[PDB]
Design a protein around this ligand. Structure first.
Ligand SMILES: Nc1ncnc2c1ncn2[C@@H]1O[C@H](COP(=O)(O)OP(=O)(O)OP(O)(O)=S)[C@@H](O)[C@H]1O
Ligand SMILES: Nc1ncnc2c1ncn2[C@@H]1O[C@H](COP(=O)(O)OP(=O)(O)O)[C@@H](O)[C@H]1O
Ligand SMILES: [Mg+2]
Lengths: 308, 309
């Protein structure tokens, strides 16, 4: 399922325009690529990009997690790491302050130290040249000392609906399910600009279409399945629709107030503060005015209300 | 507790060279070389260590083998001055971890100390004052070759004589205020097994008998009846050792017997027979340990008044 070429990678055009240059230069100079840091929201394809980079350079790759790592970091750098090989570390911001300090000598001078057994004298290993790739959601999650050893720093942006449609069609042709292009476009539009969301949504749609016995997933069947899942034309869930309703019909675009936030939902200020608001702000239907949160005209028109 | 080397009772052969070594060490204003004292238990090596320390005019640091690994550093760095004396009684009981921390302090006077403690931390080498270490072991076999290699002077403690034991008995009687004659103390020392503890115990028992008898002075004869009532020969064997020899000679013909059969005949524990009564039956020429059993020598026949084989 994972692509093995920058050409097969779907929709990170701006990032690829420079990644191709850097990889071409590194290959021409016959030396390992400089350490790379990938930003961007989850689900966009960072691990796939790491695998694509390794395949482009023709070298082995050793994905490991952030909180997976003491001396075990040197254990995994010493045995399986030959001349330059991508070492992907997902969630680089979660490193403890015990191996992060050990990363700097290893990724600057390629030397590591291990002490155990008492003797217990320091043993310094001449690590082979290698490239490290790290992934984190935001620039501010990692410390400034860590955002200095990375030669290349790149950002990863949300996919457009067309690119998600192409990915859904590729998944369908790989699995062996025939789908019309318009159904894939609708599925991509309902996806919140995320690849794995589109994958899961297509899997659910094909699950709903298999029981009906339809051989081709038509646009009408896709729309019915998406409505059954509880998604509108903008991809908002039922929780988003109901919070928008209880804002617009109870305050008329004014501040919601902390007291009334849990009154109409009977829920703690949990997912409301981190799972619901970010997408509503991203879609542009909610604006954080200093006086209070204001539902824009997009909310009024989207919720089936007459124009003001 | 003797203080000077002239007050020590009966280590004449050792004292003769000890005087020379101590005088040579004092003349050079240099600490004595490390000393190791061999000898069977019960001969007073700690008293000799105290006498040596007093003669050198230096304080003590007395410690046994099984005392507490890291306490060696504590005892070496706490109360050791220039030329201080450390006496490790039963030095063959030191653990290997504690053994491989002392010879650096014997050949170079540098000790590595664990400073961080707790988890696996680092160590620092610390300099110590020059000192002399006296070791005392009854089992030379368990002393490894490296440990024996660092000892400059090695000497042996030998068994006392009836006269030195008599002198010890006289000293104890004088301390306790009991009047005893020279020949009585000589008899008590003769019936001892060349050991000071045994001589003192015999003297105390004879004192009990004489005091119960209401006698103000212990003479030769009173000691003789006291030791006869104690069941003792002219050589120091109790009734049990004579019984062992008589059973070995009469019941089994003196030939090889074995521990189990002899112990069954005597109604005694085989380990008790082997580890309590036999070692003094040997060392007197009264018994042998053949691979086929235990044999009685001709000295056993002569001692018991039996015809020779
Ligand atoms: N030669 C001696 N002169 C005077 N007192 C002695 C002598 N030997 C031992 N003692 C006394 O014995 C007591 C100390 O015990 P010791 O018999 O010296 O220990 P030890 O010689 O090491 O015997 P073992 O076999 O090691 S238990 C003190 O009361 C000393 O006065
Ligand atoms: N551009 C792309 N083209 C094809 N498949 C993709 C692309 N981006 C992501 N995928 C799919 O998504 C999966 C990896 O996404 P994921 O691991 O969720 O991203 P992240 O590592 O940021 O969490 C892969 O199985 C891959 O098939
Ligand atoms: Mg002893």
């Amino acid at each position: 399922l994972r692509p093995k070429t920058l050409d097969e990678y779907i929709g990170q055009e701006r990032l690829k325009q420079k990644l191709r240059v850097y990889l071409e230069a590194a290959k021409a100079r016959k030396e390992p690529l400089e350490h790379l840091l990938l930003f961007g929201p989850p689900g966009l394809g960072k691990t796939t990009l790491a695998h694509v980079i390794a395949h482009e350079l023709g070298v082995n790759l050793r994905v490991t997690s952030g909180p997976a790592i003491p001396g075990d970091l040197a254990a995994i750098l010493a045995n399986s790491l030959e001349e330059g090989d991508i070492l992907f570390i997902d969630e680089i911001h979660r490193l403890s302050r015990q191996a992060e300090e050990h990363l700097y000598p290893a990724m600057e001078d390629f030397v590591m130290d291990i002490v155990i057994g008492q003797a217990a004298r320091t043993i310094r290993l001449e690590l082979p040249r290698f490239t490290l790739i790290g992934a984190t959601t935001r620039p501010g999650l990692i410390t400034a000392p860590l955002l200095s050893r990375f030669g290349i720093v790149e950002h990863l942006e949300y996919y457009t609906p067309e690119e998600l449609a192409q990915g859904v069609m590729r998944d369908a042709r790989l699995l062996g399910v025939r789908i019309t292009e318009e159904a894939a476009l609708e599925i991509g539009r309902r996806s919140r600009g995320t690849m794995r969301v589109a994958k899961r949504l297509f899997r659910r749609v094909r699950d709903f279409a298999q029981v009906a016995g339809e051989e081709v997933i038509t646009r009408e069947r896709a729309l019915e399945a998406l409505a059954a899942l509880g998604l509108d034309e903008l991809g908002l869930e039922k929780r988003d629709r109901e919070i928008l309703e209880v804002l617009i019909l109870r305050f008329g675009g004014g501040p919601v107030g902390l007291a009334t936030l849990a009154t109409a939902l009977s829920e703690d200020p949990g997912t409301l503060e981190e799972v619901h608001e970010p997408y509503l702000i991203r879609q542009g239907l909610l604006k954080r005015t200093p006086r209070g949160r204001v539902a824009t005209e997009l909310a009024y028109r989207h919720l089936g209300y007459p124009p003001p």
